[PDB]
Design a binder for these strands. Structure first.
Ligand SMILES: Nc1ncnc2c1ncn2[C@@H]1O[C@H](COP(=O)(O)OP(=O)(O)O)[C@@H](O)[C@H]1O
Ligand SMILES: [Mg+2]
Ligand SMILES: [Mg+2]
Ligand SMILES: [Mg+2]
Lengths: 50, 313, 309, 312, 312, 312, 312, 48
DNA sequence: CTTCCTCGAAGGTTC
DNA sequence: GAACCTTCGAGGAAG
């Protein structure tokens, strides 16, 4: 159920449902929570710079 | 061509022309490019013409484009790659550049490089493109709407000004020599006096007198022919049109100088509100013939003495 | 036809007509194209008519478009691509073109080339020598950089009684209706100085003579027809007379405010100011003052009242 | 029906009606379309009604639309080119068209053609579109809001005027026969004199009297029922409403006739400044009960002899 | 429920009720929809409540919306498309509608149709939307803002009046029974004299007194509880607030009753110029405490005795 | 946490607390919600805190939003559908809510139902929502910026005033007890007088003086330290801010004391009109530094002797 | 140095710099994050530089972004998720971010967590995210433009201000060494005076004088050369630019010092009226050359004597 | 070469070019061994 | 970018 | 000379 919850949370943050699905779908961890997924889906998409 | 090509030929603008010469010579005394330059002034004083002279005097090639033609960062970056060491890039109406591109220019001007960021997360990387030294030259008519971070990068400023009778006359003399027509110096002075200090107006008047002189005359512009031509046209010795005279005459004869509102004056001369405020009123203010007040327009003593009517406070 | 075709047919406008003849002859003698011309002035004076006469005198084929139709740069670029050497492009109501399109014109008028971006791509055009003619009623609405590029400015003026009399007779012969010289003069006085208004009266008077008369316009029919239309010999309408009468008999000539006067005649405020007052002020029947407007001595004599300062 | 259909039935407007008869007859003898017509003037005087009468007398089909519906040039360009030779186009509330759309009519009205841009991309091209002979009819309350170049193109101008008591009495009697009620000639005049000169108001009063006569009466309108019903509506013999009477009374009893300012008068009657100046004051001035002066409003002698005081 | 549901429960407004009864009964006999009606006047007097009563007496469903909710003509067309034969449409704050949408009702009210443009935009044409019979009810606080052509189409006009003490007292009693509270007739009269003639104010005071009377009273609204509770709420025995009292007191102690100008007085009370003229002064004039004069305004004898000073 | 949570902890505002206690208690005997309440006055006096206290005393949940956060009618519908029976909705900056949305609150407050149109085109349809009982608490910095239709629907009003020296002293002593800190009575009284009568300023300054007493002192707040710390900050002996000093120094030097309008002054001091009118002007006027005049504000003699100028 | 790392190396801003030192080390003694800090003042004074110094003195890695770079709430949450305990987040033009961000930033700054609500009707849940301690540093060009409830969360205010003559001479001297230009103390002071308080102007003038002195002299910037170079640049000894002299010179010769309005003035000299009242008038009024009378601008006595005109 | 091909295409996308047009622009370059800088330089240069 | 409208100034009368 | 009333004119924020 955390899969849909994470996507629903990202939709609230302004991500499109299609992109939120693709973003969350890139991550895979059956035991991850909606919170730990969100903390990963965002880190994977933000462009870090040095 | 009509446009001058070198400082030796460029008439007037001695203030800006004198300053630029010192900066250009100091740049040549070093293996360096000229500082970024911005040109200010009203329409029609040579802002476009001056850019070419700077390039020729620098001994460099000139790249030319306009603000509206640039809409994506790649447009500017692609043009910037074309620039060889010391090349001059001229951007017209630089104030119309979109923010999407305006924001890219800062690192280019200050560091001569662009650093394109790409990727995301662990794939986040950037590529660094070295740019050869160059000098950006900008021209604008509405400087007040530039952003402050851009204005902070320009190191040289030039304010254009209206030409004056001793030099505006020489532009008529020279232009009359491109056509095959002889003109007396006294006739050229009469044309300059009415050109409002603007080169385009002087050239337009000369073209109109040329047609008359070769159809209603012997094809020579003498003082006698000039008076007839300038009598067929409405332009007075102060440069006032027929309607300009009608405005002043109306205010003095019917309202005793005012104050009078814009709407009331428009219906008396049978013109649109927008036309009197934009076509005719601006020059009357600069010449000092009328003032604008919270209660309406009012004529000044300077206007009374020109029309030839008695004046009393 | 109603529209004159050559300067020999064009009555009046002696100032503008004289200048255009000099510049047209000089251009032909040099085999060059005419400079860009701007025509402006009040409605109904002849701006559109003069544009066609210029083309006929130059001996060229005229391309015609209008400002409201050009919505995007692609529209104007297609039109400009069809111009050949010496062609004349006429744009009516030029004041409506979006300023995004005028900026494309700044360079095309001076250097005769177009180098612009337009699914987006670049486009380049080299333009042959051509003459642009613009006509507008709101000249001040054009940008200062555009007005500075026009080389000829023609400002239209109102006509005089002798010119209008000659125009009325010319139009009468097209309708093949007989009219006397003094009858034609009585219509001219009422035409407010405008050729279009003079033609409108003639059309209405003709309709009366065909139904209530013998199909001939004479000093007797004209007086009856004009009384039915209720147009004074100074050209004042029924409502115009009601305004002056109300001011002289209820406010002693003024001053009175626009709001007070409008409600007293049962008229809308915007209609009095924009449709009736302009002609009354230009003819000198009313004057505006800081406290209101007052009827002048000319109004008293016309209405038949004793003036007292 | 409640709207007249021919000049035989259109009572009043002698000036406008007489002119249209001559111009319509002349147009038929020459076998050509009627010139463009603009109808303007106060509300409820018969502008819309006359537009249909013209179409019937000309014997052609009438196409109808309104200014508020036309919002872009595409709409007007589509209405045009759907016209057949001799059609009549009627636009109501013509003052609402955008000025960018009015300027398209300039060529259509004078030269029967319009310039159009067609296609896309490299296929973009201009073309002339040619129109058959047609007559445009406009109706508006705000003629001063139209552009000067547009008003100059209308060839016929009709300014409507208020009706007189003989004409209004006949209109009431005609309407009384569309319904099934008998009305005495003496009672018909009693309504006409209270209708402020407007046909719509005369019809409204009759409808209200009909409802009273068939509830509190025997279903017939006579001087007795009329007098009673008008007492319930509280409309005096001059057409003054309840609030109109209160204004005049207060001016004569507290300020001795004035001069008095609009604000001071509004607060004393518990009305607001805008309702008094826009709803009630306009009719009181046009009928001569109030006079406006630099110092304020003043009650005239006609008001004193109407309210029953002495003009000392 | 607080809102009256039928003409038998609706206290006051005798002039408006008497007329509406006759017009509603006559409409039923003919089996037709009722003519359009406009309700206007001060806030809180019962305009919205009267609209619901009319719907119940006619026996139809009432659709409800408001002027400022409509922003473009598309919204109005959607609302009218939902109408069913005989429905009543109530529009609150009708004067807030934009003029461009107000002019669309002109044809709907007189002829029950609307001109609408249809099609994707490349090909399009106008068509008549035909509306069923319906009754429009409008309510407004300032009818003077409506255009003349709109006001002329309403067939019934209802001008609301402030309530008198006899009727306003019955409203306080009626409300007490719904709240299951006991109130002595002397106490009901006290609340009425302080309610400025407005039912909305009377109900608000009763709710606050009821809370006080049961927390530190003995559960009954006696004449002594009302005096104490109304002191806490800061409502004078004439309905004046502390700001109103400050104005009157200053005029008596610092100017001997005036005359004094509005600008001078406003500064002496630390109040904004326009607030005093629009928010506080109107009630003081209507009640007779202040009088405007050509040289300023003066406090009358009534204002002196109410404060206890000596008149001279 | 510093925020009080019950009426026993909330210091000051005796006039407001006394009324809320009665109404909240009376609303507990009956099993119903509290009436809608409007709180207004200067910023930082504690009106947001009162909303939490009201919720805790009733024993219900609190939801919080602001006028600017609601952009369209659909936003409010989503919020109102998420309220349980008896919940409290708190709306800050209520005076900035969009007019098209404010019209929807009137119905929800007065009748507890919402009529809304949903969908588009042929799918456009109305919805009727029936809401559970709830209490709206509104907060505004401007007493008179609300519309009269809105202000009339609130059943309870509370004007909040600046705190006096004894109250702020107790608030400073309480705050210095939540933090691990020690303060002498002499220092607490000094800091209170310096705190512009505002609790938010008092708490903010105490946090800063605490830091100075540790690095530049022995970790204890004494009058000798408090004087130095407050003089290192810009806080004047009278508690005037840097903005306050600019205002007074500009009026006395650029206008010779005035009069000057606050509108033109706003742009000369480079401060937003609404901030200077609502945050700063009220204190300077209420404490006698600035006085009102017909033309505008003028600096009093007290201001000249404070800034050290000569009262010429 | 010109690009300092620690406060001892930073030139000027002694007031702001002295306050930060106490707060920075005080936070270290308690081993906790620093309070949120708001920097404000004119542009180009060194706000961005100071943010790096604060990070070094704390001993933390700086993270940087800007208001316009944030477009949706998720953007900020992502950045905040990437934070490490003690990190400092710098936001330039913090007032430009959309309100949808501020709604989340509040609880982030105050509670160090965010609670994204989800579900509707019978479904309602949230996700609760823990955040490590951090310090927010914001910089703006104005104070009043910041959201009121946001401005209350910042605990430290840093008012930046224009540099004094001693500081500018030191900056000029350091910059000259980078260019390898030899400049005497008198020449450095002359440039400092005319740079009118801003380092960017001081750098620009020095570069230009270098070019002149390298050609019109021996590469040594002497006082005699510096004064000649400045007259060639047309820079007045009071720091008035070319256009500034034109405004003053125009008022004296064409209007006798005025009064004259901004509309007329902006038309006489070919300029955009906004530019004059925004760029040029501020410096001329602050220095006492121009006064903003209600009738219009007027030239003061200083301007007459400064420009070299005999006063009236 | 996929590293340089992807970098050049992705960097070109960061400059506002469409993915398809960016692919075509880079696809026109023959030399795979040249660095992304040379690839983007020539790609932008050829489109000038 | 434009129209509306509202805020301000001032002419004139009276006590 | 203080207080009322009417009329005109130019901005600016709500479309
Ligand atoms: N009576 C009081 N007792 C204790 N603390 C108070 C009191 N009033 C306000 N405060 C404190 O001061 C601050 C006031 O903030 P808030 O109540 O939100 O102000 P407002 O809502 O008026 O803008 C809070 O920190 C609050 O705890
Ligand atoms: Mg140029
Ligand atoms: Mg034409
Ligand atoms: Mg009609």
């Amino acid at each position: 159920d955390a899969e849909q919850e994470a996507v629903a949370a990202l939709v609230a943050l302004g991500y499109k449902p299609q992109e939120a699905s693709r973003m969350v779908s890139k991550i895979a961890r059956p035991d991850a929570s909606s919170e730990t997924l969100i903390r990963d889906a965002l880190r994977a998409a933000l462009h870090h710079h040095h | 061509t009509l446009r001058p090509q070198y400082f030796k030929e460029y008439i007037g603008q001695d203030k800006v022309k004198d300053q630029l010469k010192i900066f250009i010579e100091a740049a040549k005394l070093r293996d360096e490019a000229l500082d970024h330059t911005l040109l200010f002034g009203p329409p029609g004083l040579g802002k476009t013409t001056m850019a070419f002279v700077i390039a020729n005097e620098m001994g460099v090639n000139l790249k030319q484009t306009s603000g509206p033609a640039i809409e994506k960062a790649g447009d500017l970056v692609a043009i910037l790659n074309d620039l060889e060491p010391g090349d001059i890039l001229f951007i017209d109406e630089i104030h119309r550049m979109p923010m999407a591109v305006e924001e890219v220019l800062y690192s280019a001007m200050e560091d001569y490089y662009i650093d394109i960021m790409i990727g995301a997360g662990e794939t986040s990387r950037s590529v660094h493109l070295d740019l050869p030294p160059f000098t950006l030259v900008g021209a604008t008519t509405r400087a007040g709407m530039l952003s402050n971070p851009l204005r902070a990068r320009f190191g040289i400023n030039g304010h254009m000004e209206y030409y004056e009778l001793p030099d505006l006359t020489e532009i008529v003399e020279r232009t009359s020599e491109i056509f095959e027509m002889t003109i007396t110096p006294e006739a050229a002075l009469e044309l300059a006096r009415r050109s409002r200090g603007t080169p385009r107006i002087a050239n337009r008047l000369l073209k109109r007198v040329r047609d008359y002189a070769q159809i209603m005359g012997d094809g020579v512009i003498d003082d006698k022919i000039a008076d007839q031509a300038l009598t067929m046209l409405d332009v007075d010795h102060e440069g006032l049109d027929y309607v300009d005279q009608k405005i002043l005459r109306t205010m003095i004869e019917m309202y005793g100088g005012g104050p009078v509102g814009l709407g009331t004056l428009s219906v008396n001369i049978a013109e649109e509100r927008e036309t009197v405020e934009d076509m005719y009123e601006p020059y009357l203010i600069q010449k000092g013939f009328i003032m604008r007040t919270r209660t309406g327009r009012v004529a000044t003593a300077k206007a009374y003495e020109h029309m030839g009517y008695d004046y009393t406070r």
